[PDB]
Amino acid sequence: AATLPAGASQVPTTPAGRPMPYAIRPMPEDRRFGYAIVGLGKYALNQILPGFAGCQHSRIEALVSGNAEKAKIVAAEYGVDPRKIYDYSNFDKIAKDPKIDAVYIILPNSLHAEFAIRAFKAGKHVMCEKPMATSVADCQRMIDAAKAANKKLMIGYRCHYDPMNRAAVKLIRENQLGKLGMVTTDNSDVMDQNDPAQQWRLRRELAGGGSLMDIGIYGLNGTRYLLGEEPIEVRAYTYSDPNDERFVEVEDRIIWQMRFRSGALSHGASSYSTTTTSRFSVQGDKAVLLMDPATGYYQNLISVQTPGHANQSMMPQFIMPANNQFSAQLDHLAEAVINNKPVRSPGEEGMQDVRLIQAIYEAARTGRPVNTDWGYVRQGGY
Amino acid sequence: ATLPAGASQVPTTPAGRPMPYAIRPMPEDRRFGYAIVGLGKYALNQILPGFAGCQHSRIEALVSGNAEKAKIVAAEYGVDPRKIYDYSNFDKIAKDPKIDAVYIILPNSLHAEFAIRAFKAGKHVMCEKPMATSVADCQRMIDAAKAANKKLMIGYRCHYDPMNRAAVKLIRENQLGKLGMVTTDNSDVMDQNDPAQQWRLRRELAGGGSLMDIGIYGLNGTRYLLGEEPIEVRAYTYSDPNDERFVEVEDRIIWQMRFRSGALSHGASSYSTTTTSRFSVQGDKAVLLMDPATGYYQNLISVQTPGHANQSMMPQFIMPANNQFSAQLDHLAEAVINNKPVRSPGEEGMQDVRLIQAIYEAARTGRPVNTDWGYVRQGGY
Amino acid sequence: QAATLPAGASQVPTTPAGRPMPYAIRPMPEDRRFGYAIVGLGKYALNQILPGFAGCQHSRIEALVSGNAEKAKIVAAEYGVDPRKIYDYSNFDKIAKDPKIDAVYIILPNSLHAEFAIRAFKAGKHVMCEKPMATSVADCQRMIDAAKAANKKLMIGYRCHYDPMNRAAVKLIRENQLGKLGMVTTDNSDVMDQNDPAQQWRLRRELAGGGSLMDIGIYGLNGTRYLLGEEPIEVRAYTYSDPNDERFVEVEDRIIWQMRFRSGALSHGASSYSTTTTSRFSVQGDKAVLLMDPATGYYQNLISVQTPGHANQSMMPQFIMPANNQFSAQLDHLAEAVINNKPVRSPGEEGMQDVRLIQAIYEAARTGRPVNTDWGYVRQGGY
Amino acid sequence: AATLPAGASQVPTTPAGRPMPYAIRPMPEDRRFGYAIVGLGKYALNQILPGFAGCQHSRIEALVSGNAEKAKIVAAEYGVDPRKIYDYSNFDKIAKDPKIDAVYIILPNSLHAEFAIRAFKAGKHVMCEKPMATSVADCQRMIDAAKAANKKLMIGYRCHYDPMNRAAVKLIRENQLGKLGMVTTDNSDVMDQNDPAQQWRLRRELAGGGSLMDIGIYGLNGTRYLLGEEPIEVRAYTYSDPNDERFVEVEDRIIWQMRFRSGALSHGASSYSTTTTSRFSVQGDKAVLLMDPATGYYQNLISVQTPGHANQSMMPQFIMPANNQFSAQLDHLAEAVINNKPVRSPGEEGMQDVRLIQAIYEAARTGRPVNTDWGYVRQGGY
Ligand SMILES: NC(=O)C1=CN([C@@H]2O[C@H](COP(=O)(O)OP(=O)(O)OC[C@H]3O[C@@H](n4cnc5c(N)ncnc54)[C@H](OP(=O)(O)O)[C@@H]3O)[C@@H](O)[C@H]2O)C=CC1
Numbered sequence A, D: 001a002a003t004l005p006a007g008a009s010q011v012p013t014t015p016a017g018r019p020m021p022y023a024i025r026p027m028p029e030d031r032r033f034g035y036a037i038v039g040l041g042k043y044a045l046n047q048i049l050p051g052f053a054g055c056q057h058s059r060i061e062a063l064v065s066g067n068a069e070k071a072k073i074v075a076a077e078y079g080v081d082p083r084k085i086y087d088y089s090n091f092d093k094i095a096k097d098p099k100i101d102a103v104y105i106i107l108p109n110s111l112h113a114e115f116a117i118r119a120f121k122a123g124k125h126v127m128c129e130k131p132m133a134t135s136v137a138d139c140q141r142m143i144d145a146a147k148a149a150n151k152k153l154m155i156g157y158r159c160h161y162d163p164m165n166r167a168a169v170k171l172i173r174e175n176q177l178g179k180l181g182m183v184t185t186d187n188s189d190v191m192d193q194n195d196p197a198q199q200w201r202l203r204r205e206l207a208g209g210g211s212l213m214d215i216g217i218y219g220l221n222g223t224r225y226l227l228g229e230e231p232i233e234v235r236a237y238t239y240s241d242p243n244d245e246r247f248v249e250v251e252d253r254i255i256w257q258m259r260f261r262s263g264a265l266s267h268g269a270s271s272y273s274t275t276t277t278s279r280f281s282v283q284g285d286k287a288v289l290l291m292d293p294a295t296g297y298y299q300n301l302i303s304v305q306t307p308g309h310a311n312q313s314m315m316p317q318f319i320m321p322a323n324n325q326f327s328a329q330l331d332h333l334a335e336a337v338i339n340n341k342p343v344r345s346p347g348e349e350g351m352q353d354v355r356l357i358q359a360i361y362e363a364a365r366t367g368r369p370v371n372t373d374w375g376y377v378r379q380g381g382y
Numbered sequence B: 001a002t003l004p005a006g007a008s009q010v011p012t013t014p015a016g017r018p019m020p021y022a023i024r025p026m027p028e029d030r031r032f033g034y035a036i037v038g039l040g041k042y043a044l045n046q047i048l049p050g051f052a053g054c055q056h057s058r059i060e061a062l063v064s065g066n067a068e069k070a071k072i073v074a075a076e077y078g079v080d081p082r083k084i085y086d087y088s089n090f091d092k093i094a095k096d097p098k099i100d101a102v103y104i105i106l107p108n109s110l111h112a113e114f115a116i117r118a119f120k121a122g123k124h125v126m127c128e129k130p131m132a133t134s135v136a137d138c139q140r141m142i143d144a145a146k147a148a149n150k151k152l153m154i155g156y157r158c159h160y161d162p163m164n165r166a167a168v169k170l171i172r173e174n175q176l177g178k179l180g181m182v183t184t185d186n187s188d189v190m191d192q193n194d195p196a197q198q199w200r201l202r203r204e205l206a207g208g209g210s211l212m213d214i215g216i217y218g219l220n221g222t223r224y225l226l227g228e229e230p231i232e233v234r235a236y237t238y239s240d241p242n243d244e245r246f247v248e249v250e251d252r253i254i255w256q257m258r259f260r261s262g263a264l265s266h267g268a269s270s271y272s273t274t275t276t277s278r279f280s281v282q283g284d285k286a287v288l289l290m291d292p293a294t295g296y297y298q299n300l301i302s303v304q305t306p307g308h309a310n311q312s313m314m315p316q317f318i319m320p321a322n323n324q325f326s327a328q329l330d331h332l333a334e335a336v337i338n339n340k341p342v343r344s345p346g347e348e349g350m351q352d353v354r355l356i357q358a359i360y361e362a363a364r365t366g367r368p369v370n371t372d373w374g375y376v377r378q379g380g381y
Numbered sequence C: 001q002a003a004t005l006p007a008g009a010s011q012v013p014t015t016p017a018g019r020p021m022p023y024a025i026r027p028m029p030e031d032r033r034f035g036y037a038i039v040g041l042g043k044y045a046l047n048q049i050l051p052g053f054a055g056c057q058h059s060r061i062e063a064l065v066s067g068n069a070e071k072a073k074i075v076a077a078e079y080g081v082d083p084r085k086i087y088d089y090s091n092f093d094k095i096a097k098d099p100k101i102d103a104v105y106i107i108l109p110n111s112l113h114a115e116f117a118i119r120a121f122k123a124g125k126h127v128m129c130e131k132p133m134a135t136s137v138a139d140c141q142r143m144i145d146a147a148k149a150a151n152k153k154l155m156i157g158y159r160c161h162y163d164p165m166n167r168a169a170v171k172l173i174r175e176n177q178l179g180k181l182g183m184v185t186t187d188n189s190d191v192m193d194q195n196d197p198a199q200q201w202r203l204r205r206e207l208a209g210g211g212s213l214m215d216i217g218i219y220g221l222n223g224t225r226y227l228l229g230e231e232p233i234e235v236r237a238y239t240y241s242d243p244n245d246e247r248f249v250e251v252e253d254r255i256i257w258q259m260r261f262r263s264g265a266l267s268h269g270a271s272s273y274s275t276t277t278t279s280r281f282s283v284q285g286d287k288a289v290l291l292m293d294p295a296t297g298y299y300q301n302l303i304s305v306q307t308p309g310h311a312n313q314s315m316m317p318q319f320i321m322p323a324n325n326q327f328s329a330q331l332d333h334l335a336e337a338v339i340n341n342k343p344v345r346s347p348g349e350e351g352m353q354d355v356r357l358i359q360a361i362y363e364a365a366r367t368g369r370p371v372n373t374d375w376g377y378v379r380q381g382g383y
């Protein structure tokens, strides 16, 4: 005679306490790691600050901006106390607060170097957004300062902590595509000069470059970790409508071709004049991987294609096997510290992309191939 | 060819800039305080984490029968430890004005009593689905809400899910033409070892099987997609008699309904088959496929015609609408703040319970059950 | 060392020269041994079947049977059929005098399947008959009896039994990729247009035998059966049609039926004459869920096995054709069955089973009570 | 008081003749235009011959083959009169048969010109497979011979008669994508030297080139008809594993990028060492078009993408609004001759591709950009 299992039969029919429920998504754990967010801009307020909620070891300790009115408003929304609101002048004072373990620099590309360096002098860990800086030299000075302060330097490569991108790298390493031979990337988005956030991006001094530096870097970096190797030479070409006021100083569209030591090739482009595009294609001799969206803030989708098949993968509809890229990025530094472990996106990684972006820019300017076989080594893997 | 003024006027040195463009819901305030009742699977996996994205809501207190757990959860959400209640002193919430409403996330059979006690404590009530395990209990919850002059809202997250609302919108815009056939399926493998599932296998606590638990999504969904109520239902249920999970509640049940407009629907719910959340709405111009239809995340809808499949889902960079969980929480807040009725009132929850009761009767007797009792959806679907 | 070209490439002449038979990436024509007499030059015959012969590997059109001489003459010319090989419904029986007519393919209104199938067997021919088999269980049996008496094969036109994607779906299910099966859902619909000549007999119960269930719901019914690989033991149903709609005065528009199988699996499906194109099947197991959509299209079928975080889709390739199209395959299947003295996958008994089940479903809808269908049908040769 | 409509009530209950039925797919009409198929190879026997069945005005009249035994086998399979089987020596005798309206050259690239010219001298129209020829000069010779015999010259660009490709061109011209700015193409497939058909493809003298001449041309030609304009300059690079016996004479992978007079850019590639890929992407400032499969023999699929939307189109599941590309291509020449109209894919169109391919190879060899602003005008649109 079929009867209910023990567990079900033991459940009281009256109000009673029960055990900790099964977890189907990352549960909050602690808030030991305190960050100091610098630059309350579009990315900071739209993605990063809201991203702390899901963190399992991170919290917002202080804010840093030149707009006190805004800073006050953003502080009240995140319970940050007014007393811990720094401006770009007193920033160095963060040194007097041991509760500020690290700083997260979300300022224009040109101001990354200086504040990162000032942050290390203040004896703090540094989370710096990409592109690292607007010059290779500055990246090195950022790295030296990191070593000197004996703190960690991490670049905001969210995709290195995105579930779907991680799944993509895994299937590739498992040889589901076979011998890799051709990678294709495209990253685009219509430039709106009226958007406060986009205005400095049109300034060569502030941005360091056009679409490549801002978004093309996703195809560049992605080609590198998807392939799991570095380019030995690059060739490129760029074109911008001469009559378009948006590109007087920075490039609109640029295309770059690369060759790797394994024999694999790649061709990708970035654009400021075409609508939303984030697509990566990795061709092997067994199958072809299509990541589309490839690097979105949300809804990434990948597919392994073979004649007659399209095996798609995306985040589940009810469970959450891994944390979102933002919250995961924030906790990755926090964890690297408390565990005395190297970071997956070290300053050396961000410097590699800057060097590569310069070799690419130089290739487009000269119209000749630029050797990039300078022996960079990815510590810890891709 | 010169650079725009805005670009040219941006300083080369560190300086303050204006409030950035918002591409997703920004936090605004935390004026509506909630007392969360029942630190279970839904509370800790979806609800509490959903407060962060709210624009007018916050966690003020916790109500639990497990002291150690309550402390751990309170610490994780910065909840004042002195604001942790148990099921005995729950009534004392009446003394804290910072507690605007309560959110009942307890087993179905306990919804009514804690909802009514909450109204006597002068609080607004947010209660999870299914509303209750009897039509009479639903009514009492409603009588209590009116006596206390407080709002009663049932946890129909799909009533605040972007994709579901987009689905309702195109249907109302007549993109499918004349509606004639809806198909629904909601399923998931019942694991009797999961503490959260244990009470679901008990008739006294659950009030029913898969229909009361997840089939209700198809039922409720069929109603808001067609934008009308069923006037007749038929159904059949079957469960493996040797499976210990279904000794008291149904595993699989199939229900068929007819609407005044002439539209028909057939749907099912299952406790023994893997994850399924699929809705289909056939019109004479196009067919809508929602799959996933009612997920926590990743919903996807598609309007299909010969040679075309127009899919819609949440964007990859922008977020034009708040997630269903945060939106649901704020909806009660805003309704109270702005003196407006809620989209998912107690009457809506009660309609489902009555219909579910009718479906069970139909499956029991094997005869059709008339449901043409004139229910009116206040404020639309 | 340094690479050199392989022998094959190095041996290719640089001048015009004959080469070997090429690699095959699609079914190649082979012969035209099996001759068909097509009965009823209507919508299905002219849009799908006659054109479907070109892709066959053993079948050909030998003669035509039509009641419209003007039309038969035109079609005969389009397919190179001997003008003398055109029969009408009166001299039909004379096909017995032509040895090059191995079989007939009845593509007539449902109510006329039985008599022409029987006249064909008496004419000593094999028979391919469209679905639904007939309009009465008794007539189905009369067709089977006539086949047995003539010692000829009887095959029903279940094209999906020879459709690549449907076979792929059946295969992954048998491989247990979905786990234990518990819930099947089907929907088959298309807007009925009474001004279409082909639909006019479908609105007449005497000619059609029934409404949407008999016409297209049968795909959901038959599909549930070969997807689960078993037979229902009981059915329950309900039907409804706008009482003021002239299309449904004699046959049903929408009908919903649910069934239970001996394995314990359940199913709920529907067919509709008033909603647009729908051909969707879903099979839920405790390990995965299969979604076939399109499920039974003339073309472009697509299937997907879904699990949290995954959707593995399968469809016909873009450059190769691993298996022949369902129409050509169906036709060749009877041909090969005769030549190799083997039974067909879709025999008269299979078609009769659906007709019995459909009658049971209509009965259940009419009485509002369940109907026991545990009558012991056994699928010879598997599903 | 509902009653049945006239049509239904008038249907006899006994066997009776009925009208012509509604057409839901292209119906056969006539077989007035006769072809002589030259070269019974992989494409001919797998796609072209089987493609005649779906034609509305075309038929196979004769076969030209160097393999007499294969020719007789194929002849019997298609009801071709045994006497209508020619070989490469008596090929010119087709001039004596008025039933042969045209020839279809499905021979190796290097032999196209030769037989097309002999066909024109034979007074026949000519359908010739792509790539047109292995030299620009040979392309012109074919055109000259066409004009000399006053017969039409059409190149086998099936995609110019493929429903989905046409649908893609139509929506672009309707401005559903906005201002076009970036096109990406990829056409790949694993080269198998054991396949008799691929053996001449590895011979430069017979192929004229590697993957670009064979399948890259789809991306090239596609970029042109999707943009609806011509490139004014190209840049390219190619690489092939030096130890692979497959690429001793022809290239494996080649990447090319182009700039158009409208300002639009493009970057594509073709590969002989990676599995099945046929993907076209067209980015505008309003939407992005993804064609994938882009140029398949079957199952093409297109999708217009915008944030939160993916509107896909493909061939219906029950109706066939337009004929398949193969039958359509064959009928296109037939209709053009019968209606005294030019063909959508004239010799000049095939020649443009060959010239552009020459420019791309030249650009790959010199590592310098090549100007292609030579004034080609698409007669009749793309
Ligand atoms: N990894 C990713 O996904 C993304 C990374 N980013 C990166 O984040 C960084 C910030 O970009 P984003 O948020 O989009 O841009 P914003 O223009 O919106 O913000 C820049 C912020 O830096 C501060 N700032 C200091 N000096 C200046 C100055 N002279 N001009 C403009 N701003 C100044 C401002 O803070 P305050 O006004 O408060 O004083 C402002 O909030 C960039 O390095 C960018 O590459 C951007 C988007 C996504």
Ligand SMILES: NC(=O)C1=CN([C@@H]2O[C@H](COP(=O)(O)OP(=O)(O)OC[C@H]3O[C@@H](n4cnc5c(N)ncnc54)[C@H](OP(=O)(O)O)[C@@H]3O)[C@@H](O)[C@H]2O)C=CC1
Residues within 6 Å of the ligand: A011, A012, A013, A014, A015, A016, A017, A018, A019, A021, B037, B038, B039, B040, B041, B042, B043, B063, B064, B065, B066, B069, B104, B105, B106, B107, B108, B110, B128, B129, B130, B155, B156, B157, B195, B196, B197, B199, B213
């Ligand atoms: N809308 C949606 O998407 C969903 C809604 N729900 C609904 O939420 C409610 C709770 O379900 P769920 O969180 O999954 O289940 P759980 O079993 O995980 O939790 C029920 C909670 O209520 C408390 N409780 C009080 N008395 C009992 C009792 N006698 N037996 C069991 N629990 C008791 C416990 O909290 P404590 O230990 O702290 O005392 C327990 O954690 C149900 O009404 C369900 O239908 C569930 C999932 C999704």
Ligand SMILES: NC(=O)C1=CN([C@@H]2O[C@H](COP(=O)(O)OP(=O)(O)OC[C@H]3O[C@@H](n4cnc5c(N)ncnc54)[C@H](OP(=O)(O)O)[C@@H]3O)[C@@H](O)[C@H]2O)C=CC1
Residues within 6 Å of the ligand: C039, C040, C041, C042, C043, C044, C045, C065, C066, C067, C068, C071, C106, C107, C108, C109, C110, C112, C130, C131, C132, C157, C158, C159, C197, C198, C199, C201, C215, D011, D012, D013, D014, D015, D016, D017, D018, D019, D021
């Ligand atoms: N398996 C599949 O995918 C499909 C199967 N079918 C089946 O094919 C059969 C024919 O249907 P379909 O082609 O669509 O329909 P049609 O109405 O278009 O044609 C029926 C044909 O049979 C002949 N006929 C003889 N007597 C009659 C009569 N009294 N009334 C009407 N027609 C008559 C006519 O041919 P003639 O004028 O030359 O004498 C007529 O063209 C049906 O059994 C149907 O179920 C239909 C569609 C798809």
Ligand SMILES: NC(=O)C1=CN([C@@H]2O[C@H](COP(=O)(O)OP(=O)(O)OC[C@H]3O[C@@H](n4cnc5c(N)ncnc54)[C@H](OP(=O)(O)O)[C@@H]3O)[C@@H](O)[C@H]2O)C=CC1
Residues within 6 Å of the ligand: C012, C013, C014, C015, C016, C017, C018, C019, C020, C022, D038, D039, D040, D041, D042, D043, D044, D064, D065, D066, D067, D070, D105, D106, D107, D108, D109, D111, D129, D130, D131, D156, D157, D158, D196, D197, D198, D200, D214
């Ligand atoms: N548009 C499309 O989709 C496609 C177009 N093509 C084109 O069709 C043409 C033929 O290629 P394909 O069918 O694949 O290749 P094959 O190698 O399979 O066949 C070439 C045919 O031409 C004849 N031939 C004469 N001389 C030679 C020779 N010296 N070497 C090889 N063959 C010779 C042979 O016919 P016989 O034995 O009878 O004498 C042979 O079967 C090419 O120009 C190719 O680019 C190819 C694939 C697809």
